Design an enzyme around this catalytic site. Structure first.
Site, mmCIF file in Angstrom:
data_model
loop_
_atom_site.group_PDB
_atom_site.id
_atom_site.type_symbol
_atom_site.label_atom_id
_atom_site.label_comp_id
_atom_site.label_asym_id
_atom_site.label_seq_id
_atom_site.Cartn_x
_atom_site.Cartn_y
_atom_site.Cartn_z
ATOM 1 N N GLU A 143 -8.921 -5.148 -3.913
ATOM 2 C CA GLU A 143 -8.441 -3.946 -3.064
ATOM 3 C C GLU A 143 -9.432 -3.106 -2.718
ATOM 4 O O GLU A 143 -9.325 -3.389 -0.853
ATOM 5 C CB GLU A 143 -7.877 -3.268 -4.422
ATOM 6 C CG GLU A 143 -6.500 -3.699 -4.208
ATOM 7 C CD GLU A 143 -5.344 -4.515 -3.583
ATOM 8 O OE1 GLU A 143 -5.565 -3.945 -2.681
ATOM 9 O OE2 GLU A 143 -4.004 -4.040 -4.061
ATOM 10 N N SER A 169 0.730 -1.495 0.414
ATOM 11 C CA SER A 169 -0.552 0.182 0.438
ATOM 12 C C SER A 169 1.145 1.281 -0.250
ATOM 13 O O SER A 169 1.940 1.111 -1.103
ATOM 14 C CB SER A 169 -0.805 -0.197 1.210
ATOM 15 O OG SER A 169 -1.916 1.233 1.244
ATOM 16 N N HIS A 189 -7.754 -6.221 0.291
ATOM 17 C CA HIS A 189 -6.614 -5.089 0.865
ATOM 18 C C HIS A 189 -5.697 -5.706 2.018
ATOM 19 O O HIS A 189 -5.606 -5.697 3.406
ATOM 20 C CB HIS A 189 -6.534 -4.068 1.177
ATOM 21 C CG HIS A 189 -5.528 -2.585 1.242
ATOM 22 N ND1 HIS A 189 -4.698 -2.799 -0.378
ATOM 23 C CD2 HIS A 189 -5.125 -2.081 2.142
ATOM 24 C CE1 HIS A 189 -3.754 -1.768 -0.027
ATOM 25 N NE2 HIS A 189 -4.169 -1.236 1.124
HETATM 26 C C1 LIG Z 1 -3.974 3.865 1.164
HETATM 27 C C2 LIG Z 1 -5.247 3.560 1.477
HETATM 28 C C3 LIG Z 1 -5.773 4.326 2.868
HETATM 29 C C4 LIG Z 1 -6.089 3.020 4.261
HETATM 30 C C5 LIG Z 1 -5.629 1.787 4.174
HETATM 31 C C6 LIG Z 1 -3.596 1.260 4.238
HETATM 32 C C7 LIG Z 1 -3.454 0.419 4.313
HETATM 33 C C8 LIG Z 1 -4.508 -0.905 4.529
HETATM 34 C C9 LIG Z 1 -5.501 -0.472 5.362
HETATM 35 C C10 LIG Z 1 -6.119 1.093 4.819
HETATM 36 C C11 LIG Z 1 -6.795 3.493 4.938
HETATM 37 C C12 LIG Z 1 -8.429 4.056 5.595
HETATM 38 C C13 LIG Z 1 -8.747 4.933 6.717
HETATM 39 C C14 LIG Z 1 -7.754 4.640 8.241
HETATM 40 O O1 LIG Z 1 -8.576 5.142 9.237
HETATM 41 C C15 LIG Z 1 -9.895 5.536 8.859
HETATM 42 C C16 LIG Z 1 -9.965 5.824 10.694
HETATM 43 N N1 LIG Z 1 -11.406 4.999 11.438
HETATM 44 C C17 LIG Z 1 -10.758 3.636 11.899
HETATM 45 C C18 LIG Z 1 -12.756 6.252 11.607
HETATM 46 C C19 LIG Z 1 -6.278 3.812 7.526
HETATM 47 C C20 LIG Z 1 -5.735 2.831 6.891
HETATM 48 C C21 LIG Z 1 -6.887 4.801 3.176
HETATM 49 C C22 LIG Z 1 -7.258 5.514 1.532
HETATM 50 C C23 LIG Z 1 -7.637 6.580 0.848
HETATM 51 C C24 LIG Z 1 -7.561 7.662 2.188
HETATM 52 C C25 LIG Z 1 -6.553 7.381 3.381
HETATM 53 C C26 LIG Z 1 -6.313 6.316 3.479
#
Ligand SMILES: CC/C(=C(\c1ccccc1)c1ccc(OCCN(C)C)cc1)c1ccccc1
Ligand SMILES: CC/C(=C(\c1ccccc1)c1ccc(OCCN(C)C)cc1)c1ccccc1
Ligand SMILES: CC/C(=C(\c1ccccc1)c1ccc(OCCN(C)C)cc1)c1ccccc1
Ligand SMILES: CC/C(=C(\c1ccccc1)c1ccc(OCCN(C)C)cc1)c1ccccc1
Ligand SMILES: CC/C(=C(\c1ccccc1)c1ccc(OCCN(C)C)cc1)c1ccccc1
Ligand SMILES: CC/C(=C(\c1ccccc1)c1ccc(OCCN(C)C)cc1)c1ccccc1
Ligand SMILES: CC(=O)N[C@H]1[C@H]([C@H](O)[C@H](O)CO)O[C@@](O)(C(=O)O)C[C@@H]1O
Ligand SMILES: CC(=O)N[C@H]1[C@H]([C@H](O)[C@H](O)CO)O[C@@](O)(C(=O)O)C[C@@H]1O
Ligand SMILES: CC(=O)N[C@H]1[C@H]([C@H](O)[C@H](O)CO)O[C@@](O)(C(=O)O)C[C@@H]1O
Ligand SMILES: *[C@@H]1O[C@H](CO)[C@@H](O)[C@H](O)[C@H]1NC(C)=O
Ligand SMILES: *[C@@H]1O[C@H](CO)[C@@H](O)[C@H](O)[C@H]1NC(C)=O
Ligand SMILES: *[C@H]1O[C@H](CO)[C@@H](O)[C@H](O)[C@H]1NC(C)=O
EC number: 3.1.1.1
Lengths: 532, 531, 532
Positions: free
Chosen positions: A334, A201, A447
């Protein structure tokens, strides 16, 4: 036996021996080796500096803190991805430029085993190196596994657009760790001449960026991007970043008179004050009310002028850069769960319709960047089939997984191939038994799913079917071989066609066999759509 | 006609001062900076060269003493000052200064031996302004320098790692010595004949510098008065991290990592750290709690820069810089001054085997005697007369021996076996300048020789002609040592070198040589400790 | 077509083309080029450092902030002196070491036009470079006009009297800009070999100071002080400055234990905190109740040991320094309105009398420095004539204008002359149509009245009589010629006698003709009075 005591440039480091099931040679494990000077005080928002040399024997025997990041999102992601039995609760600190080493070599003798440096992911906003245990991979394929950490969120990517705070602190931290590898890894039985970087990622994107960066030249010899490349828009900010800098500055309670003023003001803030601003900025979650073009999902990479001289796109145009064996892969689904879930997508109904779709796709602008005008034409090419809502919603998720990873990964692979460098592609389609309970049982190849195979979760965790244990054994062999020869192939493993003009790739899972033209149809479609 | 010396960093203006019966007036310079104020980020870091000034700096006011308990500081200043009026001092992190007293006629070249004094105060309190050099300077014709160094947290805070090694205070000390090399010539002093001497902690510092690689070539003769590098209380052996974390938590800081602690403390204000200093309750004997946890203070540590390993190990190999080294103690180190300050339970003026063994245990931080050996030591000393009041005194001798007595002698011996000129002395006299509260049975109380050494009789009032003479003698002795690395000279008793016969000098009303000082005690404790 | 992009040492700079009425070649204007690193944080009260080099193209297209000062006093002065149509509202910030450039040269070719660096005035407490627009001067006389800024108030002149804070930060800031011009101006079609510095008021004094400073040696080749020199007492602190330092420290809430403690304590203060103290210190205002000998009207130049090795008086004794063509001039009525106005002078009756006079003169001690004993002898030599009170006031005001600028300017001129260097003097006597309404039509040649002619205000403002337009055309030709040859003269302009032993100067205005021995009678009178 007796604690391992390696001798590095800045002084002696003491570790701990750990044995893996059915393995004679114990693996030497050093946790928390500093690769740079803590980026505290005036060092915040500046490149990382060489670490101060110590006097006696530093005890690298405790998991280093993870860089400041929202503590909930951070601990959560740590559990859902960890390949070990117990999830280790971590601590937060600006003092986080540390790396962990897992060496299977018998340090009492010379050894130059291929090195594998892992750049964790987490949207550049969260994550930690301690989450990934290298014991297994290190033991099973006989490679030194190194896990690095780097400044995240504001701390690692705050950019004013000018020389007062260029940005990419995080990537620089990354580059820093690789320089540390070149100058030290040899003392842990690893070959500084055969370093292979691989990330997932945001980690994978980092790897794709380093491959493009001039600074990273000669710090690695083989790259592997899993579920993420430099064309994954959401992670790279192209355009005037000044506005975001200013928003952040304001949220933290700062004057915005000039760039230099903002940077300064911010350096004065306490870590908590900044962690508090992060939370206020409401990153990592989908904004459903507001202009989708203003919503800022994270603080990512930028074209600083030091790490990246120009947009990834322009860069890959000229093959005149450092080209190395590069393995680029993606997972079957993904956007299947883990992400639409962590971001809080309006999909509790488990079904969708043309109208709701187009609206979502629009509100998802920050993630996919599709113009409100083209929304209709895209929502159709994917959802225009079956009238089945539940199918439309499953196609909706594919729609996104394609624009974020699918097409981008393939486009990057192709340009790398046409650059004249050994290229390989893969598509992981499996559902680890380590998935969360909350993840539907139908969602396969979500993912970060390949992570469990890649880091040998089956040999550290519990309940792996004999089928899954084999999948992991294979993936590691494959990965380790690449690390070794810039070619995954080897005896005892299926054949992995090189990604050439035929565009052969490898479908991995219960049934591992080659194929061709991955996402070919999609890359073609989106390419024009975006051409307007 | 104010004196205006020219130093490397610029011109310094001082003030002339005459002493009773001395033609040549002594040039006095108060407050010359030998390093850049360790303020802001410079806290917990090695001292840096002072900024050079443009015109004529007025070295005419007593500099501030490093931050420390204003009460304990001022009190010690009075009880040790060799001058008429005690000078009330000011507190500040900006304290890296030194005072100079040169009896030379600055209108001519002069290369008089230099004597650098490192005040004591358990590395917690003290100042250089307390000790006046007017007398010693005029009487023996040597340039006297009094230096200051960072105390308490400011000078000895250590995380045990590279993020804050520690020994800032000792580093400041070395800093001062470097300054002397590059400048003292401009005050009629001979940079090639520098002698360092300290009392108590200062005595310890002097002993540490003799073992330190960094101090190599900055002095040519050393003198340790009532304190050496084996005075356990002052040297921290073992993981110091715990103490760091405690301090950090007290001041209201996170303890996530070492770097974090140092950083958070750097942000604290002076008042904030001085406040923490009080809370930590150093200098006070803790009577309730595990005696193995009570931290008497912050002391020297094995940083890797100033001290490459424990003093004990170091003195094993005579391969270091060996120089004439004078090591002495007083008849009754623990007789009053020390016990009184720390507030001791001897308000009864008597003790008994049971009570003793308990105290000795609660004094663990000071002596470091295991709870098992306590019984065996409490006996070897108090096992005689059943007289409680005699035990109450034998008890005090017990401590005086483990803290200074044996340690000093052991250090003297190793230096001797190193092949270097060594001398020992035992001061037994009760200065007429003692405090009233001081019982008139105590003769040789901690820091009693100071009045003799700094010619208190010629600056204070009411010195008996007998005392005047004791002072005249000691200085002569000291000065000669600073001059030739041998205290002897005509008009003075004979001081036998500390060789195999182990001859030393008993000083006082009756000053005559003797042998094997504390010999019996060195042997005893050595084994007890060998368990 | 569009945007000029010069290439400097620290990186490319993007500006904007501006055309002036009746001029073919458009003028290239760059606003806000940084000539030093922001003096924020620890850099406060320390000499200025070279600016951080940038990576792409910096947009020099916005007016830089003006250094922290009295926003009211600051904006007000800006208005009363601005030569442009609309007054541009500015911003406050410690980040202010910028300069603006106006180059009439066709940057597509090599050009080495004389360079004219302007140091604005404002009693070293207020002012800004953006107030003065160089479009006209640059166009009309074909010279590259550069306007610089420098730390004012506490930020630029706080001194402890020792090495812990020498002072004159502001003047070092000035020197820094000039070094920048040497190393960069060539890229804007300027001749680094022909730089001329000129300032009005405090700016005039500064110019006079750089002429005496060793640090300024070789950074300019011609100087011009307008209504202000190094002998204008009010601007130069001679004596122990420690006291003032301590007051300021105390006002800002600091311990005064030692110099170093005070400097450190002040570095910790925020800008607002210091701005707040600046206000409390009641500067730039006349203290009518208290010892006139304690009232500190401002923080000024001092004898630091770096910029000024000794008092300006002593220095000028030995002609052994860098001598260059120097034009020194004053205005007919320096103390006519503007200053007495701003400082809030009690003269609301429009009349005075021997008694009242002597009291004011006394309370004006900081400004003139006349001992209470000599007050009577001076009040007389000037007011002893007509019994007309209103005449006494006019005379009273002349009394001051002579001690502050009159004599001082002439004395500086003579010494420079006797040093063997080309010297020129001038007396401006004209009432610009741009004056304030509140300014009585009686007053002519008030402080800073020549500014409008010097900067071509008639060509940017509105309502200039044909008489005024010409006065300006002439003044600029004169100034420009000087900048070119170290001699104002040229064809088409009146004759300007050099300031030699005849002491010929030039009266400028409606009627521009030479004269001799400017203020000669006054120089002589005050010289003895002060000799006591
Ligand atoms: C690179 C994709 C990603 C991820 C992600 C990265 C690695 C593994 C799984 C997910 C992401 C998304 C939300 C998040 O936390 C939300 C808080 N909540 C618990 C309330 C933490 C990580 C991302 C996509 C779009 C914008 C920002 C990040
Ligand atoms: C679109 C497939 C889906 C999802 C899903 C939503 C977002 C991203 C990925 C998957 C789902 C899963 C669980 C859920 O709620 C659990 C109750 N708690 C919220 C309390 C609500 C929705 C679904 C699966 C089976 C039946 C119905 C819907
Ligand atoms: C190295 C011996 C010493 C001394 C000392 C040093 C030189 C001369 C005289 C005494 C000491 C003792 C108490 C004190 O303050 C008590 C004030 N209030 C806290 C009550 C200050 C200093 C010491 C002994 C044990 C622990 C710590 C230091
Ligand atoms: C072991 C030396 C000592 C001390 C002493 C012990 C520790 C620290 C400081 C002093 C002493 C002296 C006087 C005293 O109280 C007087 C008030 N009234 C009760 C009289 C209480 C204790 C002592 C001296 C002479 C005889 C007996 C004991
Ligand atoms: C060097 C002459 C000068 C000036 C001045 C400089 C250039 C042009 C015009 C005037 C001055 C006076 C008052 C002032 O503000 C008052 C604010 N109040 C209304 C609150 C701002 C500037 C001055 C004279 C004496 C002491 C200090 C400065
Ligand atoms: C020295 C020139 C001056 C001044 C002046 C005083 C201080 C600073 C600057 C200027 C003046 C102007 C107007 C005034 O009052 C108007 C009230 N009205 C009701 C009349 C009182 C004094 C003056 C001008 C013309 C005639 C008489 C004096
Ligand atoms: C501070 C702490 O308690 N953790 C350990 C650290 C950690 O390794 C790093 O903070 C992060 O890994 O390093 C030590 O072992 C060491 O240098 O001797 C000290 C300590 O045991
Ligand atoms: C209180 C104090 O010590 N500071 C004083 C310093 C000293 O030189 C050094 O601090 C060392 O005395 O400078 C003065 O003496 C001086 O030159 O006028 C005055 C100032 O008060
Ligand atoms: C913060 C701001 O808006 N000011 C401008 C600054 C200027 O350099 C100076 O602050 C004043 O001109 O930075 C730019 O010029 C730049 O290099 O991109 C653009 C920016 O608009
Ligand atoms: C480092 O680990 C070793 C284990 O062999 C231990 O002896 C040592 O005390 C540790 N360091 C410290 C002081 O924490
Ligand atoms: C710089 O100016 C150009 C043209 O005026 C503009 O396109 C660019 O966006 C500007 N840079 C900034 C400040 O964003
Ligand atoms: C020495 O000189 C300083 C100024 O140079 C003066 O203020 C001071 O009074 C003199 N020394 C003292 C404080 O007696």
């Amino acid at each position: 036996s007796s604690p391992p005591v390696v001798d590095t440039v800045h002084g002696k480091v003491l570790g701990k021996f750990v044995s893996l099931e059915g393995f004679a040679q114990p693996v030497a494990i050093f946790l928390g080796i500093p690769f740079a000077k803590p980026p505290l005080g005036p060092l915040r928002f500046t490149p990382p500096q060489p670490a101060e040399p110590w006097s006696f024997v530093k005890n690298a025997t405790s998991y280093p803190p993870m860089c400041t990041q929202d503590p909930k999102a951070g601990q959560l992601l740590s559990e859902l991805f960890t390949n070990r039995k117990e999830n280790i609760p971590l601590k937060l600190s600006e003092d986080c430029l540390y790396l962990n080493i897992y060496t299977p070599a018998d340090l009492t003798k010379k050894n130059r085993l291929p090195v594998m440096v892992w750049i964790h992911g987490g949207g550049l906003m969260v994550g930690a190196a301690s989450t990934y245990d290298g014991l297994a991979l290190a033991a099973h394929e006989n490679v030194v596994v190194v896990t690095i950490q780097y400044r995240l969120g504001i701390w690692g990517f705050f950019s004013t657009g000018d020389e007062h705070s260029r940005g990419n602190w995080g990537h620089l931290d990354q580059v820093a760790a690789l320089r540390w590898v070149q100058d030290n890894i040899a003392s842990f039985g690893g070959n500084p001449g055969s370093v292979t970087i691989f990330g997932e990622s945001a980690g994978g994107e980092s790897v794709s960026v380093l491959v493009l960066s001039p600074l990273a030249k000669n710090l690695f010899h083989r790259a592997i991007s899993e579920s993420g490349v430099a064309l994954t828009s959401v992670l790279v900010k192209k355009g005037d970043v000044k506005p975001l800098a200013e928003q952040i500055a304001i949220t933290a309670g700062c004057k915005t008179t000039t760039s230099a003023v903002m940077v300064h003001c911010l350096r004065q803030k306490t870590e908590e004050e900044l962690l508090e601003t992060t939370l206020k900025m409401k990153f990592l979650s989908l904004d459903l009310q507001g202009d989708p073009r203003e919503s800022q999902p994270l603080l990512g990479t930028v074209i600083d002028g030091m790490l990246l001289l120009k947009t990834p796109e322009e860069l890959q145009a000229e093959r005149n850069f450092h080209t190395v064996p590069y393995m680029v892969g993606i997972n079957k689904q993904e956007f299947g769960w883990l992400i639409p879930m962590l971001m809080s997508y309006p999909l509790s109904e488990g079904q969708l319709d043309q109208k709701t779709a187009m609206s979502l796709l629009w509100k998802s602008y920050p993630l996919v960047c599709i113009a409100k005008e083209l929304i209709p034409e895209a929502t159709e090419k994917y959802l225009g089939g079956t009238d089945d809502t539940v199918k439309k919603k499953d196609l909706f998720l594919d729609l996104i997984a394609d624009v974020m990873f699918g097409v981008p990964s393939v486009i990057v692979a192709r340009n790398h191939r046409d650059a004249g460098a050994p290229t390989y592609m893969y598509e992981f389609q499996y559902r680890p038994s380590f998935s969360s309970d909350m993840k539907p049982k139908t969602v396969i190849g979500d993912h970060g799913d390949e992570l469990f195979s890649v880091f040998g979760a089956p040999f550290l965790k519990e309940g792996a079917s004999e089928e899954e244990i084999r999948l992991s054994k294979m993936v590691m062999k494959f990965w380790a071989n690449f690390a070794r020869n810039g070619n995954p192939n080897g005896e005892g493993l299926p054949h992995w066609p090189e990604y050439n003009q035929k565009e052969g790739y490898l479908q991995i899972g219960a049934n591992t066999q080659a194929a061709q033209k991955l996402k070919d149809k999609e890359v073609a479609f989106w390419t024009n759509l975006f051409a307007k």
